[PDB]
Symmetry: D2
Subunit: 387 residues, 4 copies
C-alpha cells in the first residue's frame, strides 16, 4: 500500500447507515469471515442484510452466515446470489452458495470498500429526492397522510388532471426489505410524469382521462431504515394489520386505510417481493367466498393484459390458493377487494431472478422492477378501456 | 448593446449547413422579412425550409413565404406551425398563419440567434454519433451496403442474437425532409439495445428469440443534407424507384433492394411523414389484387396490436385506397408486399400534430416519434407470437 | 386540492433523517409556526437546524425560532439567510430576519414539501457514493483508520503516484455542522482525480511529482448524522481533543492523530466554517511562541499564493490573535504546527456569504466551497515549487 | 457475420462530411490501404485528413499515406500519432510511424465503423449548439459581424457586465485545421459563463469588473467544413491578410479587423496549433522595432502569469525570432500589437503532445486545450490587476 502503516490486512465490517443490518461473529482472516443475519428490530423475523466491508481489496473473502437456515425463508437461499456494490449506485450479483445450513458468499473485492446486500436497496434520501422532484410536475401532488411510529412521513403521491374518473391505488413496500417494490413505483411514476424516455409517450396522458392515481411508494419507512425485512419499528407486520390497524402499533396502515376509505377506490395494487419463487406473479381473491363472476372476468382479463404488457410477468407459477386462507382479510388486497369489490391484486417480484429470463450479472434488480412498473401502465390503460 | 458598433438592427439569414434551405427576397426591417421555400436541388418539389436568423433579439419578426401556395403540399400549411430553436437541441412551435397564398411566421426571438425549420431536423452528425455508439452493443452490427450519389454511406443496422428467425425490415426517410422517420428509428433502436429507460425491459430480448432486425435509419443521406423534401441529390423520388432502381440515379434503393432480395424478408415497414394529415396512420396493400385473405387477417391483426401499443396510432383517418393505384409497385411497401407476401406497411407521422392528442408547445416532434418507434416493438412482439 | 380529504391546511414538520434537527413548539397556522434550535445531542452547543415542512404549498409561512439568542453564535443570525430546497438537491436562500432575540424565516413554499437548513447539507449517502467512486481511480486508495463512537468508519483518502514526496494532510468537518468543509474536500478531490471540467488539467499531475495527499473528508460522521453543530456523539469538541484524544470520548481524533504521527506530515490544513464572519479566511500559528522566522516566511508566501488562486480568499478580515491563546495546542492546526514545524493552517468559510462577492440567490454554498477547494490545489503547487 | 451476404471483407473509405478530407488510391485488402492527404481546396497546402473506414472490424489495417513528405509540415509526422474514434465523440491515438517518405497507421478497429483524423475535430454543429446555449447566459451576447466567402456567419461572442474596462480580444482558428483552437475557446467560455465545474468560481466575476471579452471561436468556418489545414474557401491564408484584407478573398479578416478597429483593444490573443513542436508556447512582438520597454515588461510579466496558471504552458521551447520577420505585420498579433501597443500574443498548442507531460492514450486533445483555455483566465486576472 506504499506506507508501512497501511500495510497488512485490516478487515472491518460496518452497518450503521440507512437499511444496514448484520451481526459480525468474526472478521480477522478474509477466508474466515463469520456473520449472522441480524433480524428485525422487534420481531423474530430475520432475512435482510446490508453491510460495508473495507480493507479487502484483492483478497478472496469467504463470508459465512451461520444462522441462514434459521431465517424467515430458508428456501430463499437456494439458487440465490447476494448483490454487491463498490459505490451504492451500481449493484451486481456475486458468487453465493447454500448447503441447507449456511449461506456462503465467495468473492474477491476489486476495491478497498464494498457493500453487500440481500437486494438492491432504495434509501430514504433517494425517496425524498424523488418525491421532491415529482411534486414539481403539473400533474402531481404529494400529501402527508400521517407519521410512522418513529415520526417519518407517510407520503401519498396523487397523479391526475383537472375535472368522475376511476381511482387507482398502488401501495408499495409494506414489507420494508422488499426494496424492489419502491423501484417498481419509481419506474411507474417516471412514466406517469413523462420523464426521460417516457417524454413523448401518450399512455399517461390517455390514462388521465380515465383515472387518477393514488400512490404510496413506501408503506414502511421505519422498517426500511432499520434494515428489517418484514416489520415496522414496533414489530408489526403491516400486511396483517388491515382489519384492525392501531395508532401506536401500525399507524402506517391506520392513516393509509383511512385515506382509501375517505377517497374511494376502483383498482388496487399491493406491490411486494417474494423470497422463494424466481418468478414475477400476481395473487387475487378468487379463492375466497364473495368473489363475483364479473370479478373473475375482470381479474382474468387484467392478467392477460399484463402478460401482453411485459414478458417478465407470468401466471403459470405462483402460490397455492390456501396460502393465506387463515389470515383472510388482514391482507391489504383481500381487504380492499372485499370492501370495494374492485380489481385488487398483490404483485410479487423475485429476490433471486426471473428464471424464465435470467441475467447472470444482475438477477432481478431495480432497473427491471422499474421497467415492470412502467409496463403495467399499459395493462391499466387496456383494462380501463375494456371496463 | 453597449458598443456603438453593435447598436442598430442588422438582420442576417443564413443557411449553409446540414439540411439548410431558404431563398431570401428581403431582410432589412424585421416586420417585413420576405422569403421563398428554396425547393429540392434537382426537382420541382418544394416544401422543406431551415435557416438561421440573427440580430433580431427582442424584435417582432414577420416572415412571409411568398410561394407557399406553389409548394408540393399547400394543404400542409393549414393549421401548421413552424418550429424554432435557439440552440438546435430544443425545438418549439411558433405562431404561424396561412391565407391560402402565403405562410407567415410571427415571432419575437428572445435571443440573438434563432433557427426556424419545417420540422425538428436530424443531422448527419447525430446519425454518425448514434450508429457509432449503437455498433458497440453486443447485439448490433452496422454494415455499409453501398454509397449514395454523392458518396455518403448507405448504412444497415442489424440487431439480433446468435442461432431460423423472422427477418424484420424497417427503412426510414426515403423522403429526406421527413426527419420524424429517423427520430422514430432512433427510439426503436434505443429500446432494442436497451439504453436509458429501456434498460430493464425484456421486450427486445423476447423479440430476439423470434426475429432479427434489418434497419436503415436514413435511406436518403444526400437529400437530407441538401435540405430537400422529397428527392435525392439526382432528383429521384426514392419511393418511386422500387421497380427499376438505377446505379446512377437511385443507388440508395439499388443497394437496399439488393440486400432485401439477398437476405429475405418476413415483415416490412417503410417509415414516412405526411404533410397534410394531422394523424398517425398506416397504409397497406389491401387495395391491390394479389392480396390474400391470410394477408388481410395478419394486417388487420397488426393494426389492432399497434392501436394497443400506442394511443397516438389510429386507423380512422388516412388516405383513400386509390391514392397511388397508378404508381402501383414503384412504392417500397407495395413492392415488398408483392415480392414476399408478408406484412408490409407504410407508417406515416404528421408534420403538424396529432389532432387527437395535440400539444401546443411542440406539436409532433422528435421525442414523440421516438416514443412511437419504441412502442411499435410491442406490436411486433404480439404479431410474431400470434403468427 | 380536488378531494375533500386533502382540502384544508395540514402543516407537518418532521426531522428524522440524516442531519435532521428541530424542536417544534407550535405548528397549526402557517403564519404562527414556533420552533427552537434543538442543539447537539450531548452538549449545550446549539445552532444547527434541518427539517421538512409539508402541506404549506402557496401559504405564507412565518417561522420563528424562540431561542435564537441562546444559541452558540447569536452574531451568526445577523445578516444571515436560511437555506431551503424542494428536493435536497438544489438549495437557495430565503428571507430571514433577526431582532436580537429571535430568528424569523418568512417564506411562501411553491410546492407541497420543502426542507429548511442552516446550510447546504452533505449526507452520509453522498459521502459513501463519492468515496466509493473515487477509490476506483488509479491514483486513489481509501483506508479505514478506525470507528467513530457509534461505529461509522473514519475514512482516509490517499491520493498520489508510485515512487520521497511532501506529505500533505487535509482534514475536514471536525465540527459536524460545517458541511461546507466536506463540499470543499469534494471539489479538491474531483480535481485531484481529474473528473469533469478537471479532466485535461495538468495541476494534479504536477502535484503528484512533489506530494502525496492524505485527506479525511469527514472527521465527525456521528455528529453529522445527529444534526449537531460542534460535537460528536459523545459531546466532545473534536478540535479541543488534539492533546489528549480518548478511545471512548474522541476516537475520531485518536485514530487520525495516530495516523498523522505514524505517516508524517509536511503541510497541514484543517477545513472549517465560521458562523459570524462573512469572509473566507485562514488562521495560522504566528501568535504563538516557537513560531520560527522561516515559518513566518512560508505562511506569508502561502497566503499570497492563495489570494492569487481565488478571489474569494482574503487576509484583511479574520479573528484577533488571542482568540484561542487559552486553548493552545488542543486545536489541530496549532498542534500539528508545533509537532511538525510545517505550514499548518485552519481555513474558514462563511455560513452567511462572502461579503466581498455576494450572491443573493445562494450566499455561500456547496458549489462555491467546492470551487475554493479545487482552487487551493493551485496554491499548493506554487508553494511546493517555492520550497 | 451470420448472413452469407455480409460475409467476406468489404472495406469502404468515405469522407463527405464536415471537415472530411482524403484521397483513396487503393482500398481492397486491409493490410494494403493506400491513401493521400487531399490538401486544401484552393491552395497547394496539404496536411489535414479526416475519413471514415467501415467493414474492417477485427482486421489489421495498414494505411499508408504516399505523399506524407510532400505535405506542408513533414516534420509534423515525426513522433506523431493519428487520432481515431468509433463515434466522433471519444478520440484516442493509434499506432503510427513515419520513415521520412510515408506515414503509416497500423491499427485493428474493434468495431464496424471507425473514423481517423489528424486531430480531434470540432464541427459546425458543435459550434452552433455551443453559441446557441452560451447566448442565453446573462453576461453573453452573440453578434454576427459578417459572412464568410461561402455565406457562413462570422460570429463574435461578447462577454461582460453593465457599466470603462479593458477590451480583451481572443480569436481562434484562422487556420481551419487547428481545431484545438476552438476547443481552447470552448473551455475559456464555459468558465466565463460559469458552466459545470466553473459554477462556483469567482474568477470570471472578478474579471468582469476589469474587462469585457470579445471572442471569435472560429475565424475560418469555410476552411473548417472543407477539411483544409491553412486556408479559407478562396485559398487565402487568413493570418497573412491583416494588412490588406479583401471583401472577396478574405472577408473573414475584413469584418473582424473592422470590428477591432471600431471597438478598440487592450489585450489580444490569437489561438493556433503547431504541427511540428510538441510544446505549448507563445510568440510576441519583441523581435520587431517599435516594441517599447513597458511592452517588454508587460509581456514578460504575462508569460510568468501563464506559467503559474498552467503547467502545460512553457517558455523554453518555441520558434526562433526571425521566423516571420519577412511577413511582418501581415500576421494578426504583430499587426494588433503595432496598431494598439497592447499585449498581443500568438498562443500555440501541439498536434502531437506536450512532450513535458505526455499522455499515451490521447496526446494533446480537446479536453487539454479546453483546460488551458480556462486556466488562462487566471493569468489575465493577474495581468489586469498588475497593470
Ligand atoms: Cl446492524
Ligand atoms: Cl403478506
Ligand atoms: Cl365506497
Ligand atoms: Cl404465463
Ligand atoms: Cl439554401
Ligand atoms: Cl410516396
Ligand atoms: Cl424469398
Ligand atoms: Cl382508431
Ligand atoms: Cl430532531
Ligand atoms: Cl475550534
Ligand atoms: Cl516526524
Ligand atoms: Cl485581502
Ligand atoms: Cl475529401
Ligand atoms: Cl501564421
Ligand atoms: Cl485606438
Ligand atoms: Cl518554461
Amino acid at each position: 500500500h506504499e506506507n508501512l502503516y497501511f500495510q497488512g490486512m485490516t478487515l472491518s465490517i460496518t452497518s450503521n447507515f440507512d437499511a444496514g443490518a448484520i451481526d459480525v461473529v468474526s472478521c480477522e482472516r478474509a477466508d474466515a469471515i463469520r456473520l449472522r443475519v441480524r433480524g428485525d428490530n422487534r420481531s423474530e423475523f430475520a432475512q435482510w442484510f446490508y453491510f460495508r466491508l473495507t480493507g479487502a481489496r484483492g483478497e478472496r473473502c469467504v463470508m459465512t452466515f451461520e444462522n441462514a437456515n434459521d431465517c424467515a425463508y430458508p428456501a430463499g437461499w437456494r439458487d440465490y446470489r447476494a448483490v454487491a456494490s463498490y459505490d451504492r449506485v451500481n449493484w451486481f450479483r456475486v458468487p453465493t452458495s447454500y448447503d441447507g445450513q449456511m449461506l456462503t458468499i465467495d468473492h474477491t473485492p476489486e476495491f478497498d470498500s464494498i457493500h453487500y446486500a440481500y437486494f438492491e436497496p432504495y434509501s430514504e434520501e433517494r425517496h425524498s429526492e424523488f418525491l421532491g422532484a415529482v411534486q414539481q410536475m403539473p400533474q402531481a401532488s404529494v400529501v402527508e397522510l400521517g407519521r410512522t411510529v418513529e415520526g417519518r412521513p407517510m407520503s401519498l403521491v396523487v397523479l391526475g388532471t383537472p375535472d368522475a374518473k376511476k381511482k387507482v391505488w398502488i401501495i408499495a413496500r409494506q414489507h420494508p426489505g422488499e426494496s424492489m417494490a419502491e423501484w417498481f413505483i419509481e419506474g411507474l411514476v417516471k412514466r406517469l410524469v413523462g420523464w426521460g424516455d417516457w417524454s413523448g409517450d401518450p399512455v399517461a396522458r390517455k390514462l388521465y382521462d380515465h383515472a387518477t392515481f393514488y400512490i404510496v411508494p413506501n408503506m414502511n419507512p421505519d422498517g426500511s431504515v432499520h434494515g428489517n425485512l418484514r416489520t415496522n419499528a414496533a414489530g408489526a407486520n403491516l400486511n396483517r394489520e388491515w382489519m384492525e390497524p392501531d395508532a401506536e402499533r401500525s399507524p402506517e396502515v391506520l392513516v393509509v386505510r383511512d385515506a382509501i376509505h375517505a377517497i374511494g377506490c376502483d383498482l388496487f395494487f399491493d406491490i411486494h417481493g417474494d423470497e422463494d419463487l424466481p418468478y414475477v406473479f400476481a395473487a387475487g381473491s378468487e379463492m375466497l367466498p364473495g368473489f363475483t363472476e364479473q370479478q373473475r372476468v375482470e381479474q382474468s382479463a387484467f392478467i392477460d393484459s399484463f402478460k401482453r404488457a411485459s414478458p417478465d410477468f407470468q401466471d403459470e407459477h405462483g402460490y397455492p390458493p390456501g396460502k393465506y386462507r387463515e389470515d383472510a382479510f388482514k391482507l391489504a388486497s383481500k381487504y380492499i377487494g372485499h370492501r370495494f369489490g374492485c380489481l385488487s391484486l398483490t404483485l410479487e417480484m423475485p429476490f433471486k431472478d426471473n428464471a424464465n429470463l435470467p441475467d447472470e450479472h444482475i438477477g432481478w434488480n431495480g432497473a427491471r422492477s422499474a421497467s415492470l412498473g412502467a409496463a403495467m401502465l399499459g395493462a391499466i390503460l387496456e383494462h380501463v378501456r375494456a371496463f
